[PDB]
């Protein structure tokens, strides 16, 4: 979609969806569009992964509106069937949100990805 | 061509048919009321194919 | 057995016999229209006025109810109780009321049938004696408020034990519980013997005949796992669809197509059964709208089976019958439909039958193949027959143009069948 | 009253009378049936 | 008398490469699997594969089914007649009956059955019928002894089925159709 | 149904507040309502009683 | 407002240790690991919940 903004490449998408698959093992990951909207308002979101091929795309465009206010990074992985399978859930997931836990073992690997997402912004 | 090699055309020649599973026709009751029999039969054939 | 088991068996046989006044004020108080207090305070003479006034309105809607005013709804038929009469005379009271609930069941949304059957409820006790043909005539109105009243009277038979939790319930009996009725192997054997009784009088109506199949589809659907259960099921269902094709009515015939196509996809039937079914679809196929549904059966029936003899030539009595009811131009307008159903495994049995039986019209046999992308083995199995035909038939130039279509596409397929049978140079030398 | 003495209408009833098992198991189809897999552990 | 062989390599992210070995190794085409993030195994089938190979050169037949494993149970079936056109093809059916990492995808030698197994959870072989993409429901039951299935194999000829475990016991079956 | 509406009404609202092109025929919304009617008539067919 | 910032960050950690306790009950196969520091966290098995 042309409404898609910052859309990660083929390369960084493999890094983002690997951290998603490791955050769903630590259960540190809230799932879905209507739950990633929650973690923004609580402020406990590290960053926001979203899908690009969701039809209609307008059902998740409020998250780039919301993240610009609260200064939380966001990208678009290209396909919602991908982010679904990497999240541990049978249904396709169109927006995924990494929560903040500083005791996490994967904290280092999140901030490596987070810096690359703020690089696109 | 061998006799078993003929049958691999007969195996590959079939196509996938959508099956009849136990939850496939239970929604048809909501549209029985005052419909013509022609337009119901296509609503069966649209499920099977 | 015990005493109280045998002594409650006498209670069923005297369920209608009014003995005490309190026994009468329980039996007479239940009815279709009036509530329990105002029903017990009125004569049969009062009810007969409202019935015979209403029944003359139903005679105006259709003249078939005019006969029952001579026999059941007559003024002399107030004094007759069921219990007083002999055993032969009761079966005639059943066979009148069984003939009545066929004609009554169609006009059941209308207000006058509610006032009409109620005298035949309250005087003739059909809510106790014969509640099968009362309920089987009115089994398709389960969502309506009139069937909720019919449940609020009837002591349910042992076969309708699925609805027994919905008697005097608030909400209507839901759509799945209607399927749990038809899932039983015995309750179907009523609904056969109700329907073959209902076709013989040629009063089968559209909303009724949908609700038959919309249950008969689901019974095949709920039993699509248990291959034993389906094996004992089609003496019940296919014997309907055999008799449901014998109907003059075009509307009954389309219902037979819905059950046949659904069962054929759920269970691979034998070759002889499908060719049997294809004759009876062909034989009584008269009206316009029954023909379109009938063609999508044979389109779908031939793809259900798969095995040796899958693509066999049609038998002689079958094929010319299919040419009689379906035209070779009309089958071409069928393939050009943008629906474009999977006509794949049938036409390669249709084309081979042309090659053996008729042979006069092989211009069509080219134009059949441009319109359908066939399967790989089918084209080989066609071209073997034509090369047999190439030697036998007195040689013809239009047959040469058929192979020119196969010199266009799949050249090696033409070679490999010739390298299986005959020579490579001899076919081009033959033409 | 009863004695036995275009295609017919009774063609579907007659062949149902003359068969007792309806599923095509006699074919040796060489196509595999869905949902029911004949297997024998060795 | 003449055929060419083709590599089908899999990126972990899900990009399928198509090298051909007859001429020196060049890409023929690329196509991404729809979805498929953490991908373990691909094996093609329906013809001659490395499990059900050929005898003479005329026996070599082009395959028809392609299956793509995952680390989340997802198998994706590709009809090889249609998927070679668009180069970003839609898979036919997304099989998701397993719950863990796929570790063995082998076909029948006739190309009608797709095994799929996981070496993580015990008793985790599932058979998939083709082309209907319906998992078989009767076998395997609960009481079908498998163990942690680590190695599945079909016969080329007789229709047998050999399933390994972690315990060491190779338990053998017979597809009674064949 | 109060979940399924408030989900699909949240799907319908973001197509209305945040689409600069509107087909203005309720084309997403009638696709939303048909999913709830499928959810509803599924959920009325199921019943807690024993048959 | 110095105290609210001291109140809230203390009050978030009550949720963070409660939310981790609430996520132990649901499904899945859990691994009891202990760090070398002594803090207890869990690691659920890589298994797509259905």
Written overview of the protein:
Chain F: Belongs to the NOP5/NOP56 family. Chain F: It comes from Saccharomyces cerevisiae (strain ATCC 204508 / S288c) (Baker's yeast). Chain F: This is Nucleolar protein 58. Chain B is mostly helical. Chain B has 2 helices and no strands. Chain B has helices at residues 3-12, 37-48. In chain B, 29% of the residues are buried. With 431 residues, chain C is an all-alpha fold. In chain C, 65% of the residues lie in helices and 0% in strands. Chain F contains 2 helices and no strands. Chain F has helices spanning 2-17, 27-45. In chain F, helix 1 (2-17) packs antiparallel against helix 2. The longest helix of chain F is centred in the C-terminal third of the chain and has 19 residues, at 27-45. Chain G contains 1 helix and 2 strands. Chain G has one helix spanning 2-22, and strands at 32-34, 40-42. In chain G, strands 1-2 form a two-stranded antiparallel sheet. In chain G, a hairpin with a 5-residue loop joins strand 1 and strand 2 (40-42). At the B-C interface, helix 1 and helix 2 of B face helix 10, helix 12, helix 15, helix 17 and helix 22 of C.
The topology string of helices and strands of chain C comes to HHHHHHHHHHHHHHHHHHHHHHHHH
| Class by alpha and beta content of chain G | alpha+beta
Distance between the termini of chain C: 89 Å
Helix content of chain C: 55-70%
State the helical fraction of chain G. 40-55%
Strand content of chain C: under 5%
Order of helices and strands of chain G: HEE
Order of strands side by side in the largest beta sheet of chain G? 1-2
Please give the oligomerization state of what you see: part of a larger assembly
- Structure summary, number of beta strands of chain G: 2
Subunit structure (chain E): Interacts with snoRNA U3. Interacts with MPP10, UTP21 and UTP25. Component of the ribosomal small subunit (SSU) processome composed of at least 40 protein subunits and snoRNA U3.
Keywords (chain E): Nucleus, Phosphoprotein, Repeat, Ribonucleoprotein, Ribosome biogenesis, rRNA processing, WD repeat
WD repeats (chain E): 47-88, 97-138, 144-177
Function (chain E): Involved in nucleolar processing of pre-18S ribosomal RNA and ribosome assembly.
Task: Describe this protein with a few key phrases.
part of a larger assembly, 7 chains, A: 121 residues, alpha+beta, 5 helices, 4 strands, 43% helix, 16% strand, globular, C: 431 residues, mainly alpha, 0% strand
């Amino acid at each position: 979609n042309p409404k898609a903004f910052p859309l990660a490449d083929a390369a960084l998408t493999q890094q983002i969806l690997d951290v998603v698959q490791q955050a769903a093992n630590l259960r540190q990951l809230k799932k879905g569009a209507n739950e990633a909207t929650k973690t923004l308002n609580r402020g406990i979101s590290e960053f926001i992964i979203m899908a690009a091929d969701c039809e209609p795309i307008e059902i998740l465009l409020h998250l780039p509106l919301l993240c610009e206010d609260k200064n939380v990074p966001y990208v678009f992985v290209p396909s919602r069937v991908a982010l679904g399978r990497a999240c541990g859930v049978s249904r396709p997931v169109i927006a995924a949100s990494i929560t903040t836990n500083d005791a996490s073992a994967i904290k280092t690997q999140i901030y490596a990805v987070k810096d690359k997402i703020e690089t696109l912004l | 061509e061998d006799e078993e090699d003929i049958a691999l055309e007969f195996i590959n020649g079939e196509k996938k048919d959508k099956l009849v599973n136990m939850n496939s026709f239970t929604s048809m009751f909501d549209n029985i009321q005052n419909v013509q029999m022609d337009t119901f039969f296509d609503r069966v054939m649209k499920v099977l194919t | 057995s015990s005493l109280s088991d045998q002594l409650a068996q006498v209670a069923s046989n005297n369920a209608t016999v009014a003995l005490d006044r309190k026994r009468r004020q329980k039996l007479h108080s239940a009815s279709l229209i009036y509530n329990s207090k105002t029903a017990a305070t009125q004569d049969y003479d009062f009810i007969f006025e409202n019935a015979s006034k209403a029944l003359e309105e139903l005679s105006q809607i259709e003249p078939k109810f005019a006969i029952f005013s001579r026999t059941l709804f007559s003024e002399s038929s107030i004094s007759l109780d069921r219990n007083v009469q002999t055993k032969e005379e009761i079966k005639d009271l059943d066979n009148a009321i069984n003939a009545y609930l066929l004609l009554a069941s169609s006009k059941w949304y209308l207000a006058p049938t509610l006032h009409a059957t109620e005298w035949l409820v309250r005087r003739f006790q059909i809510h106790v004696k014969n509640t099968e043909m009362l309920l089987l005539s009115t089994l398709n109105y389960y969502q309506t408020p009139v069937f909720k009243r019919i449940l609020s009277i009837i002591k349910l038979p042992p076969l309708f034990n699925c609805l027994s939790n919905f008697v005097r319930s608030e909400k209507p009996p839901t759509a799945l519980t209607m399927i749990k009725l038809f899932n039983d192997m015995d309750f179907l054997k009523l609904y056969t013997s109700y329907l073959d009784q209902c076709i013989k009088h040629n009063a089968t109506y559209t909303n009724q005949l949908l609700f038959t199949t919309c249950c008969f589809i689901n019974v095949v659907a709920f039993n699509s796992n248990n291959d034993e259960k389906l094996n004992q099921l089609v003496p019940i269902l296919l014997e309907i669809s055999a008799k449901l094709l014998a109907s003059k009515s075009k509307d009954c015939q389309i219902a037979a197509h819905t059950i046949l196509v659904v069962f054929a996809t759920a269970l691979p039937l034998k070759k002889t059964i499908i060719l049997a079914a294809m004759e009876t679809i062909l034989s009584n196929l008269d009206a316009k709208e029954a023909k379109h549904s009938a063609l999508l059966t044979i389109c779908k029936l031939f793809q259900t089976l798969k095995g040796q003899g899958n693509v066999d030539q049609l038998p002689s009595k079958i094929f010319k019958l299919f040419d009689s009811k379906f035209d070779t131009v009309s089958i071409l307008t069928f393939l050009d439909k943008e629906d474009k159903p999977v006509c794949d495994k049938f036409i390669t049995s249709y084309t081979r039958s042309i090659a053996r039986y008729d042979r006069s019209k092989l211009n069509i046999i080219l134009s059949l193949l441009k319109k359908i992308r066939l399967e790989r083995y089918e084209v080989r199995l066609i071209i073997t027959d034509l090369i047999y035909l190439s030697e036998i038939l007195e040689d013809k130039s239009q047959l040469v143009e058929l192979f020119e279509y196969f010199i266009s596409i799949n050249e090696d397929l033409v070679l490999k069948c010739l390298k299986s049978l005959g020579l490579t140079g001899x076919x081009x030398x033959x033409x | 009253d009863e004695s036995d003495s275009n295609g017919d209408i009774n063609a579907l009833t007659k062949i149902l009378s003359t068969t007792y098992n309806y599923k095509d198991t006699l074919s040796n189809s060489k196509l595999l049936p869905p949902k029911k897999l004949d297997i024998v552990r060795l | 008398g003449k055929f060419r062989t083709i590599l089908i390599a899999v990126n972990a992210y899900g990009e399928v490469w198509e090298f051909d070995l007859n001429k020196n190794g060049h890409v023929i085409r690329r196509w991404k699997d729809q979805g498929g993030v953490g991908i373990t195994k691909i094996q093609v089938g329906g013809g001659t594969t490395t499990t059900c190979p050929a005898l003479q050169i005329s026996k070599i037949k082009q395959n028809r089914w392609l299956a793509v494993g995952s680390e989340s149970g997802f198998v994706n079936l590709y009809d090889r007649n249609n998927a070679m056109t668009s180069s970003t093809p839609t898979p036919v059916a997304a099989l998701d009956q397993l719950t863990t990492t796929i570790s063995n995808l082998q076909f029948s030698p006739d190309g009608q059955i797709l095994c799929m197994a996981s070496r993580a959870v015990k008793d985790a072989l599932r058979l998939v019928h083709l082309p209907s993409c319906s998992v078989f429901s009767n076998w395997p039951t609960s009481g079908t002894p498998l163990g942690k299935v680590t190695s599945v194999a079909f016969s080329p000829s007789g229709g047998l089925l050999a399933v390994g475990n972690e315990q060491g016991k190779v338990r053998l079956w017979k597809l009674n159709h064949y | 149904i109060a979940r399924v509406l408030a989900a699909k009404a949240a799907v319908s609202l973001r197509y209305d507040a945040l689409a600069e092109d509107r087909d203005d025929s309720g084309d997403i919304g009638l696709e939303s309502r048909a999913k709830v009617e499928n959810r509803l008539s599924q959920l009325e067919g199921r019943d807690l009683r024993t048959t | 407002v110095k105290q609210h910032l001291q109140r809230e960050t203390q009050l978030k950690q009550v949720q963070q240790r409660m939310d981790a306790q609430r996520e132990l009950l649901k499904k899945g196969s859990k691994k009891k690991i202990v760090d070398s520091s002594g803090k207890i966290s869990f690691k659920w098995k890589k298994q797509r919940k259905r």
